[PDB]
Design a protein around this ligand. Sequence first.
Ligand SMILES: CC(=O)N1CCc2cc(S(=O)(=O)N3CCN(c4cc(C(F)(F)F)ccn4)CC3)ccc21
Ligand SMILES: [Mn+2]
Ligand SMILES: [Mn+2]
Length: 244
Amino acid sequence: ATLFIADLHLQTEEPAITAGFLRFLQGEARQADALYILGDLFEAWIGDDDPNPLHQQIASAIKAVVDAGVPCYFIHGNRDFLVGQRFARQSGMILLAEEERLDLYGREVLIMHGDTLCTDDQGYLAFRAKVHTPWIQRLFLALPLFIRHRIAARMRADSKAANMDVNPQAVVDAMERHHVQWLIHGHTHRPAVHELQANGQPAWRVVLGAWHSEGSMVKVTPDDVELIHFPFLEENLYFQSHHH
Ligand SMILES: CC(=O)N1CCc2cc(S(=O)(=O)N3CCN(c4cc(C(F)(F)F)ccn4)CC3)ccc21
Ligand SMILES: [Mn+2]
Ligand SMILES: [Mn+2]
């Protein structure tokens, strides 16, 4: 069974999500053939030299899964597109490109974060092209940490004040470029299974959920595809004395 997660948005202000991810890693992920994280693991990222302790805690927990024999892969999200090869080494995770095609027990599956499918949000596309320009990233990463913190906090406030689903033709385009009948992504926070047609045959798009009140994962076995929602922490059972 292969596991897919996305859109956790880990941040120190939300310790329950972090505790839920740690429990996931020490329970579900240890039994997997592989773990794919399709972007937005963290709520923000300004470079791998950030001494934010949460980054180290998360890196050590993933590395433990990797050391238990479960390979771990990461595709960048729109929030954490600056995760680099230093963090990859500390966590044992492999960085993948923005589009990848996998063989999952015989079925060809395309995986991506999903933000590049949102071709109607032309404000987002302009922002994305900017911060994904290599010379603009290198210039930003070369600034002092305290400068990068101030820039990022200001850009986050500017986006909340300036406040989309995928384009259907963009879905078909990618699934036909890669000649696949299965696509897995996140980003939209709308967990669903969508049926469509691609390459003259039935096709499916599986969307992950964000970790808001509960966790979410897609599990792919040789027999089925599973969208699974679960609580973060171990919810102990206790009884209330209801009356007939
Ligand atoms: C829509 C969206 O995706 N948004 C909205 C707002 C925001 C904030 C962060 S961030 O806080 O994590 N952060 C901000 C600063 N980033 C930069 C900045 C520059 C430069 F200053 F040169 F333009 C270059 C390269 N990267 C890294 C990421 C992530 C994502 C999104
Ligand atoms: Mn997200
Ligand atoms: Mn996203």
